[PDB]
Each structure stands twice: as structure tokens, then as C-alpha cells.
Amino acid sequence: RIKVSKAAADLMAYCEAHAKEDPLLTPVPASENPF
Amino acid sequence: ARKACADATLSQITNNIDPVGRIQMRTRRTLRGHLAKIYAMHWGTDSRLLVSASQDGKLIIWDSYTTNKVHAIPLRSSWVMTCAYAPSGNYVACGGLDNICSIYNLKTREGNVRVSRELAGHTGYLSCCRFLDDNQIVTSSGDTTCALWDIETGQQTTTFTGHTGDVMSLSLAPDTRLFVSGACDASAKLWDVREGMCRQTFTGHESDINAICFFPNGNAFATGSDDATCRLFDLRADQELMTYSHDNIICGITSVSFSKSGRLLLAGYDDFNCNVWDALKADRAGVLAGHDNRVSCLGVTDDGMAVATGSWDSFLKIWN
Amino acid sequence: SAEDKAAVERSKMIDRNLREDGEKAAREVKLLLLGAGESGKCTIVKQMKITGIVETHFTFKDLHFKMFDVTAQRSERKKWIHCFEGVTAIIFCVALSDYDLVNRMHASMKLFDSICNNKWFTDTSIILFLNKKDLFEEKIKKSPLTICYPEYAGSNTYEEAAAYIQCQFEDLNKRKDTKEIYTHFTCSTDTKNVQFVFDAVTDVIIKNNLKDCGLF
Amino acid sequence: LPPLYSLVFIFGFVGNMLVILILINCKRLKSMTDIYLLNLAISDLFFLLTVPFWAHYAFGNTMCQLLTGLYFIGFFSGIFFIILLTIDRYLAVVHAVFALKARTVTFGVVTSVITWVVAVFASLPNIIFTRSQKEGLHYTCSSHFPYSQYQFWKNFQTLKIVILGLVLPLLVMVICYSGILKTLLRCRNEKKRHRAVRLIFTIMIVYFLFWAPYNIVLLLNTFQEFFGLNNCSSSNRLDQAMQVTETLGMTHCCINPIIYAFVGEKFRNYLLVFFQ
């Protein structure tokens, strides 16, 4: 049972690491986008 | 009990994070091949083929890239409320009110789909099915019990009990060692696939929970209930974290899905359209609409290439 | 373009056979069976003609009928009643003799009021059946109907006791102009009970077609 | 009178298109009766596009032969479609179980093409005998027949334009709706039947108030032996009688959606969804 701050820090760090390679929040070019 | 661990709120920690912003997401293509209402939909591991279940007795597998129907499995029972897609991609599951989790083998001779195995043993109506792997599958039923299944024998390998109300949905963690399910008693239980125990209980909702989805790292998950609130829970602190409630919305939530990054949360509402939530700010960042009827399904690909929403208007749309 | 053409070609075959596969559902009549206890789905299914839900297929007057019984479903109805939204008609089976036993008729309307005033059953009519009529007269002769409702059914006579109960089931709905309610007293003959079902569903087909024909 | 032509296109043109624009996106032709009104919407515009070009608004013989045809094929297609809708309505109610197997799209499109090709077949004698007397006007084109067979073609064209005009549809209007009313008074809903029975009488009478005046002046114009030739004074008065009836016949084409499509209870439900 860790503190909420330690668990919250893990969630934001995971989102920040995968933020660049996220097609939703960062749109991708149309040719690279299969749709 | 564990209120000592509630030292601070995630919003205060996430107050310094730059907002996602009003992102605009459009429908690249619409899948209109069904005839009855759509109740189930799952995404493939290859992010290429998705399966959807409709009330017409047809289980259609859609090719997302080319907008084509790969398969059309004739269901024995027209009433279906859940479906699953195997991680290997060989089998497809489908439940319903018949208490039968019919599993069909796609890789067969001459491309003729056949029933791989008939699953029985649930007294209540099936509500959710998820493939642990090609050999095992977890099924949620309306008899307030969920059990693990084996393909080649069909026996009750492991039964998870402890839910006071009937389970509506469940999701699997990326490491597949743990999974949680949401029942109608505003509670969520953590079950181990190997031990079948009740490590900790998640609750806090004011109505029946209808949506379950894990955070991409596997250390957290979010729930979607009919109390017009989406609640995110963590497996470590075991508390309520960043409830997603807005005064404009009063309707319930039917499907909750997470993006691959986990920064923003997908939530399906029965207000004739779907909603996009910020998983760290609880801000309504971007709203997508266009469904003729209320939406019932919502899923995101493994790579996050696209997100699909399944509504009752017999239409499937892919959003980017 | 050999691979993509074959994928679309085989997908066209998938779309072709669903045109008549779903058309057969339009010809077929979807009927839902409700009941407070074990009295549901016992009368019509007893006719000699052809796990969670048992469905009966029978063709009468060159019309396909599909009857669905949900008696085996012990889960909460609020979670799966929306799955049956859009059926042709709803068949309600209630025993007229179920008033002196523990109170069952009070639970019958409690089930009946929930399904009749449901938000997903606005366009779907209900054909309620007052079963156990053969022994209802003997039961009311043995004990008065006043033990069920404080407002007595007239003077405890069979001619007006059954007529009182049917009205007590037909006035629970507020949406009388939205849908019609068909009441029939089941007899000791399979051909008589199925005849009312055919005529009642026929009126539903007439009503349903008028919205598409534009008359309504 | 010039403003009367603009009033027809004020709501009839885009109203007809709004029906097409709402059946594709929302209805998706799930019902079989939906395709009987979209080709009906194509037919009335085919009759509507002739109105601006009929008033000599601005190519001697080829264009008006298409304009004369676009009037007739546009007219016969719409008048034959409403016959099919009443037959569709007749079979829907008086034979409930027989229609369920009959009401199918695969039968709806095959019976819509054959009634399209009988309209061009019944109209082609007009295109064959269509030439322009005055090239300067560029819009005055009439039916010219050989002197030996002038009485044959003039009578046959008139004999077919009236029987296919009123008596064949009105005979279907009465034999079908009589059976419809015979299968409607038992609907045990007096509040809803009152508006249902009232509206079906309007469909019959407005047909006799828009196409009958065209036919009433037509037989007298064709059969001069009765009154026209003997009088010879009303001919100048009857010169504009055809023109005022054509507009009175043209305005029947723009009231089809309000009497066949906008009167369905579920139809307005898609209207607000289309507006969004």
C-alpha cells in the first residue's frame, strides 16, 4: 500500500514516456496513417 | 482503513502538467454492414482485423484497413452481448443470453469457419469474455460469478467468486497475471489468474459498473458506471483516483477504453455519442460524435493506431 | 491488384448472403415471454407443433413465429431487458389462480408494470394471457377475490371477476395511445390460443407497417 | 402569374431533394417502400425541370424532343409510382402475412425498372412525332402527324393519356383504400384512427383537384366535335386553359413529399437528426 503520490508519479511518468509515440494525442502524417 | 495512504490528490500533482487541449478527431471510415443493433466489439492484436457481434445472428470480422468483412460466423443464438478476439488471432469468442460461450476456429480447411468448442457451466447470462491466450479464456456471467476456462476440455479450471452482484465487464492486464471485473454492486474485484483470490476490493461508485479497462502499464485501471462518473483505481494504493464527472453529463457510461499512452481516456456514454477524457486532468478534452444511436462499444488498438466505437445504430466507426 | 481484389470479392459474397439472412428475421415474428414465476411459458409451448433462453419455432397460417422465454434468467432484468428491444410483440402469461398464494398477482403486475412502462418497449405491444381460467371459477367459489384486492370484483361472480382483473392489467400503462394491449382467456385447446396470437400479431404488423407506409 | 412559377421551385425543388438527402444518410433504404419514393423524387424533378424551359426561357429539333420527353417520361413515371405505392399500401394491410414475404428489396427494384421502361415506351410516340414549327422561338415544339393518320395518332395519344391519367389510378385509389379502411376500423385506437382515416381521404381528393382539371379541359380540347369546334369562341379562352392546368398539374409534383413522406410518424424523427 504505497502512497497516492508515489502511485500518481508512476502514472504520469508512464504517460510522459509514451507521449511522443502516441498517435491519438499527437496526430501522424496521412501517408503514415493507414486510415 | 487505508485512508492514511491518501496523502495527496493526483490533480494537485497533475496541476502543473500541460493540458492535452481540445483535440479534434474525425471518422476516417464507417463500417455499415450489420443489420441489427451492435452489442459487442473487439480489436485485433495486429491492429488490422476487428470482430463485432450484432443481434442479427451474425458475427462479422472487419478488415479495418480495407473496410471488408473477413468472416461472418452464423451464431446459433441471435442474442449476443459480448465477444472476444484471441491474441494469436485463430479463435473468436462470443457470448450472449444463452449461457454459451461459443468459440469458432478461423484457420480451417477451405476457409469454412466452424465451432471450435461449446462452453457451458454458467447459470447466468454471459456478459464479458476475454482471451488470456490461445488456450484459456475468462468469461463473465450474470450469475455474479466469473470463471476461467480451458479450450480442449471445457471444464471449470478456475472459478472466481466473491461478487455480490452480477458482473457486467472485465479486462485483462498486459502481463495477463491479474485481471479485474466490475459488477452491479458498485464494486470491482482483483482476481489472480493462477490463484483465483481477492487481493483487494475496489469500490466507490454510486450505481452499477458497466465498463472495465486497465491502464497500459498494468498498475492501474478505470471503471465506467451509470452514475455519470468514470473512476480510476490503482492496484498499489487501492483508492479512488481522479473521478471523471461533469455537471453537463448526467447519463451513464457503457464502455471505457484506454489509449496506448494512457494519457487520455476513452469513455462511451449513452447520450447518442462518445466522449474523450483526459486521464490525468479530468478535463473533457475533445468530444467526438456522429453515431445515429447510443454507443455500446469502445476499443483501442495495441499500438494506438486507431480507436473504434460500436453503437446501436448498426454502424461501426473508426476514429483517428 | 490480385490480393486486394479477392478480399473485396469474398467480402461481397459476405454482404450478399446477409441480404436474405437478415430478411428471414423480418418475415419471422419475434415474441417475448414474461412471467412472475413458473406460470410463464407453459400454455402456448404445450401445443404439439413445430440453455438460458429456450426458443420455440412454429409456423401458423404461413407465418413464422419465434417465441423467447426468459424464465431461466435469474439475473437482474435491468441489465438484459434492453437486449430484447425491437421485438414484434410481448406475450405475458399470468395465472388467474395466483391470487390466494403468497400475493403472487401483486408481484405479477410488479413485473408487468416494469416491462410495460419500460423505455425500450414503447413501440412494442403486449399480449397478456390470463391463464388458469378453468380452475379460477372454482377458486373464487371456494374463497372470494376480496383477499387479493380490497376493491372487490363486483359481487364475487365469475362473469365480472375475470373482467375486473383484465381491466386492472390494462389500466397500469399510461401510454395507451402509443401501444395496444391484447387480452385473451386461454382455453383447453391449442388451436384456440394460437389463433389469438396470430390475430394479435397481425394487428401489430398492420400497425408497424403504417409508419413505414406513412399513414401514421 | 410569373411569381407562381417561382413559388413552385421555392419549396418543391429543395424539398424533393431533402427527401433524397435524408433517405441515403439516415434511412439507408432499410425499408422496401423507401425506394418507391426516391425514384418518385427523381420523377417529379424530371417533371419540374421542364417548367422553366416550357416558358420559352433561354437547338432546333434535338433539344425540345428531349424536353418534350422529359415532360412525358417525367410525368408517366410519377403517376405510375403512386399507383405502386397504393398497391404497396394495399398489400401491406389487407394481406399482412402475404406482404411479409412480398415486401422485399429484390422485388422492389425489379418492379421499379419495368415501370420506368413502360413510361418511356408509352412516351416514345410523342418523341417520334415531335418537330419545331418556329425555330426562332426555340421552345415551341408540337406533335405533328401524317395527314392520312392524323386522326389515328391524335386519338390514340389522347386515349392513352387520360386512361393512364385518371381512371386507371383512381380505380386503384378506390379499390385499395376501401380494403384499407376495411382493415383499419378495428385498430381499437379511435384517437389515432381519426387522423389516419382523415388523411387517406385527402390523398384521393387532391388527385381529383390537380390532375382532373387538366383532363377535364383535355378531352374537350381534343374532342372539338362536342363543344370546342361548335363554339369556336372559347378556343381563345381555352388557349391559356392548358397552361394554367399544367402549373396546377405541376404543383401536384411538389406536394408528393408532404403527402407521402412527411406524413409518417417516424419520418420527422429523422428530420431533426438530419438537421443536427
Author numbering:
A (entry chain C): 27 to 61
B (entry chain B): 21 to 340
C (entry chain A): 6 to 55, 182 to 233, 241 to 354
D (entry chain R): 33 to 90, 96 to 313
What did the paper state?
The data showed a wild-type level of basal and chemokine-induced activities for the engineered receptor. The ligand-free CCR5–Gi1 structure was determined by cryo-EM single-particle analysis with an overall resolution of 2.8 Å. Our ligand-free CCR5–Gi1 structure provides molecular details about how a CKR activates the G protein in the absence of an agonist. Lacking interaction with the chemokine, the ligand-free CCR5–Gi1 structure exhibits a more open ligand-binding pocket compared with the chemokine-bound CCR5 structures due to the outward shift of helix I, the second extracellular loop (ECL2), and the third extracellular loop (ECL3). Close inspection of the structure revealed conformational rearrangements of the aromatic residues at the bottom of the ligand-binding cavity. Compared to the structures of the chemokine–CCR5–Gi1 complexes and inactive CCR5, side chain of the conserved CKR residue W862.60 rotates toward helix VII by approximate 90° in the apo structure, occupying a similar position to the binding site of the residue 3 in the chemokines. The movement of W862.60, together with an inward shift of helix II, further pushes the residue Y1083.32 toward helix VI. To form a hydrogen bond with the side chain of Y1083.32, the residue Y2516.51 undergoes a downward shift (relative to that in the inactive CCR5 structure), placing its side chain in a conformation similar to that in the chemokine–CCR5–Gi1 complexes. This rearrangement results in the conformational change of W2486.48 and subsequent rearrangement on the receptor intracellular side, leading to receptor activation. Nevertheless, this does not rule out the possibility that the specific conformations of these key residues on the extracellular side are stabilized by and/or resulted from the G protein coupling. The mutant W862.60F displayed a basal activity that is 70% of the wild-type response, while the alanine replacement further reduced the activity to 50%, supporting the critical role of this residue in inducing receptor constitutive activation by altering the interactions within the aromatic residue cluster through the conformational change of its bulky side chain.
The chemokine receptor CCR5 plays a vital role in immune surveillance and inflammation. CCR5 exerts its physiological functions by binding to multiple chemokines, such as macrophage inflammatory protein (MIP-1α, also known as CCL3) and RANTES (regulated on activation normal T cell expressed and secreted, also known as CCL5). Here we report three cryo-electron microscopy structures of Gi1 protein-coupled CCR5 in a ligand-free state and in complex with the chemokine MIP-1α or RANTES, as well as the crystal structure of MIP-1α-bound CCR5.
